[PDB]
Amino acid sequence: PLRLLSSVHYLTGELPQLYDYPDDGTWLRANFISSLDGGATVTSGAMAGPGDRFVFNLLRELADVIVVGVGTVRVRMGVVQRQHRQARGQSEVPQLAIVTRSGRLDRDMAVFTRTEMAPLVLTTTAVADDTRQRLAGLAEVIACSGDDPGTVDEAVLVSQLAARGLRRILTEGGPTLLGTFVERDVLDELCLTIAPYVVGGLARRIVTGPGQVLTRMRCAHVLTDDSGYLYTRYVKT
């Protein structure tokens, strides 16, 4: 009933295929890293070696847009990355989209200053106009409310991105945003690097919040390196 996994193929070229987005339709992929004991932070960078950086950069290269919660904002491509993106018919650098319920973003933000192009600000119908005026010249502000003008509806958010030709979506956090995607069951795929460390009880998980679900996912692949990291890809359902 059990089978041993082992190294069977040196990844030839072949990696982007293992992380391909579907040929059509919207697809929301998350990429996170955690310790063996489920801790997300030490930031997570301390747990991330060269292999994980390689996967991380690849997933950014494949994405139309990278969606990030505003807590975490408090995107570089190199020549080859830009080439590959252009060949596949994408913008040279992926768009950044920042999720905020309050819209309380400052112009003086690091996020607005060191980019090639204006990020998207994804927010509610209720604060969209004022946010649009305050961020004039810096960001495109998009209302992502469903039935309730005072909240962000995750399915609507995803649809708003798709409607702008940004159907291949990547999110890297933070844990609150990811927790809402998981709670609302709009997360299509989780790529998770399992780092070979234990960190003890203090650290938070890769998801936080009040939500509680039991969403079955299918294991699409597990990669590894000599350092004993596991680079996993799981897909609904």
Ligand X SMILES: NC(=O)c1ccc[n+]([C@@H]2O[C@H](COP(=O)([O-])OP(=O)(O)OC[C@H]3O[C@@H](n4cnc5c(N)ncnc54)[C@H](OP(=O)(O)O)[C@@H]3O)[C@@H](O)[C@H]2O)c1
Question: Which positions touch its own copies (CB under 8 A)?
Answer: 1-11, 15, 18, 34, 36-40, 42, 46-47, 50-51, 54-55, 175-176, 178-179, 182-183, 187, 190, 192, 194, 196-203, 205-219, 221-225, 228, 230-232, 234
Whether 134 and 154 have beta carbons less than 8 Å apart is answered as no
- Kindly state the smallest distance separating residue 172's Cβ from its own copies, in Å: 14
Point out which span in 2-10, 43-51, 77-85, 93-101 binds ligand 44V (CB under 6 A): 43-51
Asked if 177 interacts with ligand X (CB under 6 A), we say yes
Strand partners, 210: none
Cβ proximity to ligand 44V, 90 vs 193, nearer residue: 193
Asked if 119 interacts with ligand X (CB under 6 A), we say no
CA 27 to chain centroid: 11
Is 71 annotated in a binding site? The answer is yes
Q: Give the H/E segment covering residue 176.
A: helix 175-183
205's contact among ligand 44V, ligand X, its own copies, none, with CB below 5 to 8 A by partner kind, is: its own copies
Q: What's the angle, vertex CA 153, arms to CA 204 and CA 214, rounded to 5?
A: 50
* Torsion of Cα atoms, 91 then 119 then 73 then 188, to 10°: -60
Asked if 95 interacts with ligand X (CB under 6 A), we say no
CA 193 to chain centroid: 13
Cβ proximity to its own copies, 33 vs 120, nearer residue: 33
177's contact among ligand X, ligand 44V, its own copies, none, with CB below 5 to 8 A by partner kind, is: ligand X
Point out which span in 17-25, 30-38, 99-107, 161-169 binds ligand X (CB under 6 A): 99-107
- Kindly state the smallest distance separating residue 228's Cβ from its own copies, in Å: 4
Is 101 annotated in a binding site? The answer is yes
Cα–Cα distance, 214 to 158 (Å, whole number)? 22
Instruction: Tell me the DSSP string of 114-175.
Output: S-SSPPEEEE-TTTHHHHHHHTTTT-EEEE--SS-TTS--HHHHHHHHHTTT--EEEEEE-H
Whether 196 and 48 have beta carbons less than 8 Å apart is answered as no
Provide the binding-site residues for ligand X, judged by CB under 6 A.
Answer: 68-72, 99-102, 104, 152, 173-177, 180, 208
